[PDB]
């Protein structure tokens, strides 16, 4: 990454500077008697202070920290009280792009600083001073650090719970503030916390801390600049962990239960009946945590992020009540029309017509549906190699080439085989879609969808590259015939020499040495060594490669299976109108303090083995 | 899963009911002096228990744990006991079809409440009342928990051994005492038992001890509803460790000497002849433990399940008196019907004759066996991939297919060639069944048995459905020849299509581009990207999948082979004739205080790493 000027080097007003830098205060003492009355005519003490990036000696004090700084910052603290200006010193700001609004007091948090950081806040800072600026606020996550840009989150950030407590016991804080990106401070631990379970992350236990000490519900109400409350920040950007704890988080003690969401029932041994809330998770509106964990690509922990308690129930009866019983129609219902193509394709005219326009309107429908499922993805979704918009595409294309065959055919260009039979023979290999279910025959499909994109594609270029050479030099190698007879050197042309050499290589057809070729013993070298280099090299070193890729992902495929139901799950709900929306799911709690708490899903989980190793005890 | 109304929830007699759910004895005062005189007329104190689902305020005190919780049941017994209802009181039931019995001593004894347990049954618990109930019954094991629905199983089930002890000297506990399912104690603790060996586990250790304190041999001798004593209840339920501890038990203090099962004779350092004791493990009358574990298919722990003391050496014995002798003996006599088809069936007529009825009387014999063995066996024992009933159902059609040649021979319909050759060709290929021995030869059996069963249907459908759809798009895309030519478009039909397009698979034929299309570009393009979606992906996708299965299941077939054995071993056991099970082994010990203990095994195991393990300290 890039910089803008750093904020210190050690490349007469630099003496103080100098002298606060390695804190000799010994030294220290009498450049400020001789700076009380340096000039003392009228500068208003602008000299105190560097222009050229704003920079003070209090921060640069605390910029680098050395066993005898406090003297330094009582000292600096007692002189600019005596000039009535400590308000201007303790309020200073960094005045560059890359460092905009950077006080002291952000640094003095961040150096571990806390004995120190209670002296700026007993003088008085303004706490709610930001920090925006462009190092502060990194484009991607590789050029800077990002915090919030509030010093409260300082303490957040980085695990200094003692600043959190001195910060919220002042009157002055604003917890509910927002930022130049829109974040809040719970946005912000969702942004630096750890997704893989670590050891020991401060993170998820500090949540509750921050949580606790708010005591209401704004805090996790409020939405970013796009518009996100926490709950679906910490989806889409992969935080599992965090996850987990704020879609399982109940409070056991009293004047703190609105902020609970799993409300315990009985605890009866193995079996539990957690009722949980779910007021964000159900896709009810928009923007639901469900919705953004499985319409997302650059999550790689979706292994344990969608089988959560308020997630894989809410699937289950999902599937259970309106996606199997559509997705067997949908199978029926395009079996047949692929089954009524036979019908017109391979019994073309070189009362059997009441399926002749129901493949025309059903291309139709599949068209019209594809269209708009085409260009409604982003395409940030097809970066991903296992996108669902290959099938859409593949959807469309089945339907485009049909409605062109019958446009064409009544139309009489003689092109009704044309588009038809390519719509065909992709129509019948388009039926490996619709093995989402059957998770036997379901774990067959990615490997296809996996295999043919990392194998197949680079061996075809190898072998494309390979054929394409040697075509040229085996049909420059031949000589012409004197037209005496017409099966005169078979490797004749380019486009001849081609189909003979890929022949060689299936294991069908014929060799032979006499090919009207003035140097048999250059033809000899060339279809030897291109059998040798492909067909013993690379047609086996394919085998070899995916040996080692199927090994590799067969425990990866479970996860993957799941990821393709949810998504088909989940895309036949935005299909239902709006009427047959009327089969929800429990709620209208009402069990919390003057409202309805949203709606609210009881569950009966168990977990014998979890309870087994509790009670071993 | 579903369930009924909740036990509990949060949602003037309610005032008692939340009173005692926080457990607030100061509010807890008061409400009982009105209730002494509220509406006193005459109700019987019905007003103090709820009547939707028979819930009083004592279990509703003990279904939420506080830690002023003691007073409270303290003050409810001195009420209850003032109005002479405190049996009434005490034993109070639960009322619905999840939860009906449910008692307030159940519910203290899980809640890990042992020193409040003992106030009840010091004020007098009935302690026999069962728990029958669809939430204490569950069908599968994913709607409940189960315990055999008695509250002395509670402290069984959950690890709560003092109050085991507190049980015990109770004079009215009734130790020997079944339920609705006919269970005892020690099948509960069999059915919750834990299978694999997960460090330390209380059911292993506190069988000794339910066992010891009941001194007697009732309950293990005592049967279930359907009918098991707990030795082949822990076979079928799949505990290997359970039925290890069973197996293997002898008690060393006298006056407990016939609860033993393994009666030690003499340790000599590494060898150690130990007489063991079987009375339910030979296939004597019915339902050996023996005879459960090799006929049994949910099992996954039968890798050490098999080889236990009373078991590994009782097959070893069987397999070398009187199992291998017939082994052989049927192999020679089925290789001898094999080879006999051939002098039938390659000499037909388009003193021999002693032969020609030798293969039809052992069609027979083999007919009117596998028809027994093919109904015998349940509908479950097939669901397993490797069960043994496809080689009996294709032993069978070796002979059904024999039986109707032979029979449509002398009734001359000329189809005497259209079964008897189906029936040779699958008699030669069913030879490989009868590798059950040969160890290194066996091993490759199962290879076959799981190989085709898990990778050759998937990629033979996958196959089918592509060759399906390239096979009428080839075919519709030719154009049909005037006629003046037969050797036109051999590409002709569908049926000539699919083979002409499934010889280019395998690799022998000829590829042509002048098939008397007039879509050459297209011909081509569909002819190439067959052999590229197929030959290339797919049939070496295959090849890379089994590289991965094969390296699974290499580690698993040591244990599959055994289990053909031991099945093949027992299987044989049922076809001897009941004079010839006059081969029984050692028995009538006397060794015991009034009679003989059935039958008792010597053998004579020795380990030298345990003794050198042992030793070395
Ligand atoms: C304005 C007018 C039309 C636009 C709105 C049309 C609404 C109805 C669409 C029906 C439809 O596409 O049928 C579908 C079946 O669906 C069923 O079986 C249920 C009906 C058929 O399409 P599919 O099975 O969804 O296609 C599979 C591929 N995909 C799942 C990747 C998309
Ligand atoms: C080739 C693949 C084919 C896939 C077919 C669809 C499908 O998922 O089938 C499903 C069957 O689905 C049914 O049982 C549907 C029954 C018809 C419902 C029609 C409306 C009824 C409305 C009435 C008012 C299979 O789903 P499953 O059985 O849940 O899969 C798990 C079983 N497994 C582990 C064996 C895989
Ligand atoms: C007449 C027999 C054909 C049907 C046999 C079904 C046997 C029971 C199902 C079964 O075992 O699933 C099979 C799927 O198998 C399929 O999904 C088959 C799909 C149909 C193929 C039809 C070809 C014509 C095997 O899948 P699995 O059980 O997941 O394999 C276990 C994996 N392991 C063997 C490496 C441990
Ligand atoms: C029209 C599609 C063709 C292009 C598809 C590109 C897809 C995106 C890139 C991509 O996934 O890289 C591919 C490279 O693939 C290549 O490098 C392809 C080279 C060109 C082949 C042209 C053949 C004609 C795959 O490489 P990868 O991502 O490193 O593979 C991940 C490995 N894993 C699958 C085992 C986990
Ligand atoms: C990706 C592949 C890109 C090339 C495709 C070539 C297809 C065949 C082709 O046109 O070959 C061309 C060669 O030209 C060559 O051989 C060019 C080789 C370098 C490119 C021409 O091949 P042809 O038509 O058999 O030659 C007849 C000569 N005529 C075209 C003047 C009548
Ligand atoms: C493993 C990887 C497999 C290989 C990977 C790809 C390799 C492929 C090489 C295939 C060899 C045969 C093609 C050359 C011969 C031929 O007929 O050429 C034709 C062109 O044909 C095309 O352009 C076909 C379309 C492109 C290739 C197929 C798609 C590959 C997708 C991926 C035309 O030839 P011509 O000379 O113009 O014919 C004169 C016409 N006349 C006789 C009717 C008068
Ligand atoms: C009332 C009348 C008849 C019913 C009762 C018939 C009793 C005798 C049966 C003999 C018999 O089947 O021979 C057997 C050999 O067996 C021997 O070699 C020992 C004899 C031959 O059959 P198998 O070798 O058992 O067949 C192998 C397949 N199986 C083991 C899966 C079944
Ligand atoms: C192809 C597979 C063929 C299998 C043949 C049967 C069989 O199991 O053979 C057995 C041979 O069995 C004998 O030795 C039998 C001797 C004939 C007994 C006939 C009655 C005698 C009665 C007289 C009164 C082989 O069994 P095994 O030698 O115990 O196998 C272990 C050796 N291994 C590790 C080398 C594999
Ligand atoms: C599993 C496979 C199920 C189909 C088996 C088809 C076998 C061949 C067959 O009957 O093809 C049929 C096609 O019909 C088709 O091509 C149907 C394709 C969709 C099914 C007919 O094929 P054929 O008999 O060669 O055609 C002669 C026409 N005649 C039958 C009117 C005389
Ligand atoms: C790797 C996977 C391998 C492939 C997997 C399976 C693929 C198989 C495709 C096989 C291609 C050849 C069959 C078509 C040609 C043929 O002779 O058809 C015949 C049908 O023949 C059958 O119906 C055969 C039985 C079914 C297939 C074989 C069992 C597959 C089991 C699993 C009849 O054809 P016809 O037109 O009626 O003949 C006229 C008769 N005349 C000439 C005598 C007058
Ligand atoms: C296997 C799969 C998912 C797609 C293959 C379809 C190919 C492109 C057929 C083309 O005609
Ligand atoms: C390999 C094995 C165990 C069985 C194969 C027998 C096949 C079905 C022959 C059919 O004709």
Redesign the interface.
Same mark, same amino acid.
């Not at 009866?268 to 079996?271: D, K, L, R």
């Not at 299936?506 to 057809?509: A, D, R, S, T, V």
């Given at each position: 990454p890039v910089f803008s000027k750093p904020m210190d080097s050690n490349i007469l007003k630099k003496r103080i500077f100098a002298a606060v830098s390695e804190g000799c205060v010994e030294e220290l003492v009498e450049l400020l008697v001789e700076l009380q009355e340096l000039c003392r005519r009228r500068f208003l003490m602008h000299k105190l202070t560097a222009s050229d990036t704003g920079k003070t000696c209090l921060m640069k004090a605390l910029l680098n920290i050395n066993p005898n700084t406090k003297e330094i910052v009582r000292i600096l603290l007692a002189f600019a009280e005596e000039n009535d200006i400590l308000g201007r010193f303790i309020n200073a700001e960094y005045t560059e792009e890359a460092y905009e609004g950077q006080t002291a007091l952000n640094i003095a948090i961040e150096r571990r600083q806390g004995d120190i950081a209670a002296l700026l806040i007993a003088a008085g800072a303004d706490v709610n001073a930001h920090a925006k600026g462009a190092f502060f606020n990194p484009k991607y996550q590789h050029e800077g650090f990002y915090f919030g840009e509030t010093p409260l989150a300082l303490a957040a950030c980085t695990n200094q719970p003692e600043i959190v407590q001195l910060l919220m016991e002042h009157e002055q804080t604003d917890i509910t503030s927002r930022d130049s990106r829109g974040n809040n401070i719970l946005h912000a631990l969702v942004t630096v916390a750890e997704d893989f379970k670590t050891q020991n992350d401060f993170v998820k236990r500090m949540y509750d801390m921050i949580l606790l000490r708010s005591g209401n519900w704004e805090l996790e109400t409020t939405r970013n600049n796009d518009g996100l409350t926490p709950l679906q920040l910490a989806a889409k950007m992969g935080k599992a962990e965090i996850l987990k704890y704020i879609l399982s988080r109940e409070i056991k003690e009293k004047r703190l239960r609105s902020l609970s969401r799993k409300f315990t029932?009985?605890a +009866? !041994?193995?079996?539990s009946?957690s009722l949980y809330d779910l007021t964000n998770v159900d896709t009810t509106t928009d923007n639901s945590v469900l919705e953004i964990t499985v319409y997302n690509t650059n999550i790689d922990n979706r292994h344990e992020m969608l089988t959560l308690e308020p997630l894989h129930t809410l699937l289950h009866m999902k599937w259970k009540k309106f996606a199997k019983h559509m997705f067997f129609l949908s199978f029926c219902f395009y079996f047949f029309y692929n089954i009524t193509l036979?019908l017109v394709?391979?019994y073309?005219p070189?009362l059997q017509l009441l399926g002749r326009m129901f493949v025309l309107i059903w291309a139709m429908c599949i068209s019209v549906k594809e269209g708009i499922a085409i260009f409604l993805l982003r395409p940030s979704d097809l970066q991903s190699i296992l996108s669902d918009a290959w099938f859409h595409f593949v959807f469309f294309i089945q339907a485009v080439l049909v409605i062109l065959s019958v446009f064409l055919y009544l139309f009489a260009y003689k092109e009704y085989? /044309?588009c038809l039979? =390519?719509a065909? /023979?992709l @129509?019948? /290999?388009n039926?490996?879609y619709y093995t989402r279910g059957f998770q036997?025959?379901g774990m +067959?499909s990615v490997? $296809?969808q996996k *295999? $043919?994109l990392h194998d197949?594609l680079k061996? =075809?270029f190898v072998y494309i590259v390979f054929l394409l050479g040697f075509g040229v030099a085996l049909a420059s190698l031949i000589e012409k015939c004197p037209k005496d007879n017409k099966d005169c050197s078979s490797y004749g042309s380019f486009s001849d020499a081609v189909?003979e050499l890929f %022949?060689l290589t $299936? @294991?069908? !057809?014929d060799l032979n040495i006499q090919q009207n070729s003035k140097y048999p013993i250059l033809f000899l070298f060339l279809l030897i060594t291109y059998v040798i280099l492909t067909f013993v090299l690379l047609l086996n070193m =394919? $085998?070899a490669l995916? @040996?080692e890729?199927?090994?590799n992902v067969?425990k990866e495929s479970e996860r993957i299976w799941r990821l393709q139901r949810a998504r088909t799950i989940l895309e036949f709900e935005k299909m239902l109108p709006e009427w047959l929306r009327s089969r929800f799911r429990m709620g209208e =709690?009402? %069990?919390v303090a003057e409202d309805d708490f949203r709606l609210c899903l009881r569950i009966?989980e *168990?977990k014998?083995t979890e309870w %087994?190793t509790h009670?071993?005890?």
């Open positions: 029932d009985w +009866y !041994g193995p079996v009946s036979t394709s391979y073309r070189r085989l /044309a039979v =390519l065909m /023979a @129509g019948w /290999a039926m490996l036997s025959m +067959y490997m $296809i *295999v $043919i197949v061996f =075809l189909l %022949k $299936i @294991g069908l !057809g =394919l $085998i995916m @040996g890729t199927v090994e067969s =709690l009402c %069990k009966n *168990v014998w %087994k009670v071993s005890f």
